[PDB]
């Protein structure tokens with residue numbers, strides 16, 4: 001591991017998001033910031049809010065510059081409105097550099113901030129094409145690269161605990177690593193496999209085959225990427241296109257048929273509980289997603305365990321049972337490889353080479369009988385036809 005200063009710099013959990021500490025302004029104002037590969041705006045609370053115990057105070061920064069422009073960002077979830085400006089930004093446990101970046105000062109929000117998440121802003125790591133108001137508002141990472149010698153690459157190790165973290169525990173626990181400008185080899189086991197970034201807007205990829213316990217879901221591969229497939233640390237669940245979700249759930253139910261679960265469970269709404277330590281991991285199937293490789297006609301697969309797709313939650317009675325929610329949801333906007341999927345892997349966002357790498361995470365949760373995997377190569381034909389065109 002060659003980036004010790006950035007190892008273990010993340011905190012949080014899949015259900016509330018993973019955040020990194022950052023400073024804004026002069027003198028520096030410390031804020032916790034949501035790491036989001038699914039959007040492209042850097043924004044921070046800048047006014048009192050019931051869920052914020054701190055916020056960006058522009059009048060206290062000598063380096064604050066007002067852009068005299070409003071900004072509106074609607075996510076799938078919530079939304080916020082703010083005021084554009086620029087200021088000096090640093091990452092304490094990151095590259096030892098300070099850059100001038102665009103910052104949206106959040107003045108109004110709805111269903112955006114999360115009670116108890118301990119974060120006060122968001123770091124959109126995707127491309128300018130999806131930045132608001134438009135692509136002229138340079139994303140933070142683009143600024144970082146243009147202004148310094150930091151390599152145009154970052155990598156994420158999101159670490160799920162495999163069990164519930166109470167409010168005090170989640171504040172003291174290491175939630176992962178964001179390596180800015182490199183790849184730290186102590187964060188994964190095995191080899192890194194790369195899939196092409198199809199287009200530079202979201203981190204878009206192409207899925208070419210899906211298996212549930214080795215059984216081919218057998219859908220036209222174009223269905224898996226309808227209307228796109230993205231890697232998104234800012235969304236908890238693995239979200240699948242309506243038709244794919246319906247097929248996947250039918251197959252996961254069939255594989256786990258020795259136990260009957262209520263419809264509310266499969267809807268990702270209600271928790272299921274087992275007596276302490278008795279969770280029947282073995283009755284649930286592994287899920288394999290095959291991704292386009294960098295070599296013509298070649299693919300590789302990433303395999304996740306139910307320890308990734310079943311999300312640990314505290315029992316509504318705080319008892320001693322081990323409880324979970326089904327972390328796979330239907331989508332109307334394409335496949336979203338969310339945080340619960342990223343928890344099984346070390347993910348390399350290699351912007352410079354327009355590719356995303358996957359390797360088994362040194363912190364993925366598993367059991368003595370099964371482990372997550374990244375395996376290849378597989379001969380796969382016509383993978384370009386798996387991509388959706390509007």
Ligand SMILES: CCCN(CCC)C(=O)c1cc(C)cc(C(=O)N[C@@H](Cc2cc(F)cc(F)c2)[C@H](O)[C@H]2C[C@@H](Cc3ccccc3)CCN2)c1
Pocket residue numbers: 014015016017034036037038039040073074075076077078079111112113114130131232234235236237
């Ligand atoms: C329930 C609260 C959020 N949450 C738990 C904690 C992560 C989720 O699992 C979740 C669920 C759904 C259905 C959507 C999003 C969602 O919209 N996430 C976005 C980031 C986010 C995190 C939060 F923490 C609260 C929020 F407002 C928002 C992400 O950028 C998402 C936005 C999408 C819409 C978009 C497109 C282009 C540009 C901007 C936004 C595109 C895919 N990425 C997030």
